[PDB]
C-alpha cells in the first residue's frame, strides 16, 4: 500500500539518528543514498540503495567502535598500493610473483593498516587478540591467518614492518562470509610468506539476529541500525 517516499517519511527520526552518529564522510554518503531511496521509481532501485546503506553504515560503526578511520570505498588502498608504500624494496619482486595472479594487486580490503593511504595502528597483535577473544568468549565466527616464511620464529632483537588486513560485513550468512574471505586472501598470505612480509588477515561478520551485546560494533550502534535500515528493509517488502 504505502509508497516508498512515504516509507522514508515515517522513518525520518530513526534515519536522522543514524546519520547524526556516523562519521562525517560515512553519514553524507548514507544521506545521498537515502534520497535515492526516497526518489526511487522501481522497487529494485530502492532495495539496491538500501543494501548500500546497510554495508556503508555498518562500516562507519565498525570504525567508530575500533577508533579506526572510516575510508570511503573510492579512497580505500589496494594491496599493491600497500606493498609499494610500506615495503618498497620488495615491490618489484611482489610484481613478478603476481604475474599469474595479477588481480591480487587490486585486492581492496575494508581496512588495510600497518604498524606505526594505508592507515597506521599502534599494535597489530592487540587487534588480533581482541578478535580471537570475542570469538572464544561469544562464539562469533572469525577467520584469521598470518604469513610465515618457512617455519620462522618471532624474534626479540629487531622490529619489522607488518600489515593488518581486515574484512567486515553485515549480512545473513556469517559463516559463509568469513570462509569465503579467508579463502580469497589465502593465496596472498602464501605469497607474503614467500616475500618475507609479515601480514595478518582478519574477517568477521554480523547479522540482525546476533544478540545486541555480541556484535563487532558497540550496542548503541546496533540499535541505530536496527531502528533504521533494518525496518526499512522490512517495510520495503510488506508494501
Amino acid at each position, epitope marked *: 500500500k504505502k509508497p516508498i517516499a512515504l516509507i522514508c517519511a515515517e522513518l525520518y527520526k530513526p534515519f536522522q539518528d543514524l546519520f547524526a552518529a556516523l562519521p562525517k564522510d560515512c553519514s553524507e554518503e548514507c544521506q545521498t543514498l537515502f534520497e535515492d531511496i526516497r526518489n526511487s521509481e522501481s522497487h529494485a532501485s530502492a532495495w539496491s540503495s538500501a543494501l548500500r546503506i546497510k554495508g556503508v553504515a555498518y562500516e562507519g560503526f565498525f570504525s567508530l567502535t575500533n577508533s579506526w578511520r572510516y575510508i570511503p570505498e573510492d579512497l580505500k588502498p589496494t594491496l599493491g598500493m600497500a606493498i609499494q608504500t610500506v615495503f618498497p624494496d620488495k615491490f618489484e619482486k611482489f610484481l613478478e610473483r603476481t604475474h599469474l595472479h595479477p588481480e591480487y594487486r587490486d585486492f581492496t580490503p575494508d581496512y588495510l593498516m600497518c604498524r606505526s593511504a594505508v592507515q597506521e595502528v599502534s599494535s597489530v*597483535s592487540a587487534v588480533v*587478540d581482541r578478535f580471537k577473544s570475542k570469538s572464544s568468549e561469544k562464539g562469533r565466527p572469525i577467520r584469521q591467518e598470518e604469513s610465515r*616464511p*618457512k*617455519t*620462522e*620464529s*618471532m*624474534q*626479540e*632483537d*629487531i622490529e*619489522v614492518d607488518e600489515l593488518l588486513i581486515v574484512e567486515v560485513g553485515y549480512q545473513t550468512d556469517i559463516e559463509g562470509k568469513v570462509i569465503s574471505d579467508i579463502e580469497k586472501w589465502k593465496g596472498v598470505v602464501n605469497l607474503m610468506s614467500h616475500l*618475507g612480509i609479515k601480514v595478518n588477515v582478519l574477517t568477521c561478520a554480523d547479522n540482525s539476529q546476533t544478540p545486541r551485546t555480541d556484535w563487532w560494533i558497540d550496542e548503541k550502534y546496533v540499535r541505530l541500525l536496527l531502528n533504521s535500515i533494518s525496518y526499512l528493509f522490512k517495510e520495503l517488502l510488506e508494501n
Partner: antibody
Amino acid sequence: EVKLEESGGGLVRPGGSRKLSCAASGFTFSSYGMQWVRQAPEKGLEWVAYISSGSRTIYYADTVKGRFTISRDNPKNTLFLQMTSLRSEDTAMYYCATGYGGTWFAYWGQGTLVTVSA
Amino acid sequence: QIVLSQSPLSLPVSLGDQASISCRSSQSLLHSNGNTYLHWYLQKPGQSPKLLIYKVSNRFSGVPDRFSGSGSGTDFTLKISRVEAEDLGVYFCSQSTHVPYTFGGGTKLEIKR
C-alpha cells in the same frame, strides 16, 4: 647480576605429572622471552619450550606437544613448566634460560633433575 | 627441524694451539628479518651450558676473546685461537631462526697430553 633458579624437580612415576618453576632476578623479567631446555644424562641438549614476554607466542618441541604447558607470572618474576603424561624418556636435567634481548640462550639456570621411573 | 651437523665429534688439541669446530645447517639460517640466528655454547663438565657467540659472530659480553665465530647461510665455524686448560668440555651450536629451536650434537674438546 642476572640469575635464574629452577625448582620442582624430583622423582615421578611414568604417566605422572610435575610442575617446575624458575625464579628470575637481576633484569626486567616481564620484557623478555623465556625458555626451557633439557639434557638427558650423558646426552646432548634438547630445547623444550618458548614463551614470549607477554605470553602471546608459545612454541613447543614436538616431543612434548599436548603434554607440557609453559606459562609465566610476570608480577612474580616466575616461569613455569607443567609436565603431564611423563615418560621414562623425559628423565633429564631441566634448565630455564633467556636471551635477555633475543631468542638465543644467554643466561641459564643451574638446572633441576627430573627422574621418571617406577 | 633444521638439522645441525657438527664436526668433528671429538677434537684433541694441545694447550696453546688453535681449534676449529664446524656446524652445518640443513637449510639456511638467514631469517627474513636479515639476521642469522646461529649461536655457540660451551658446557664444562658438571656445569650448565654457557653462551660464547650469538648471531654467528657476536661474542657475548665477558667471554674471552680467544673465542670467535664466522660463517653464513648453512656453514659456520667456531674458532679458539689459543686453547687453554679451562676450554675442556663440549661445544654446541644451536639455531633459533626456525621453530623448533635445535642443537647440534656436541663436539668434545680434549686436551692433548
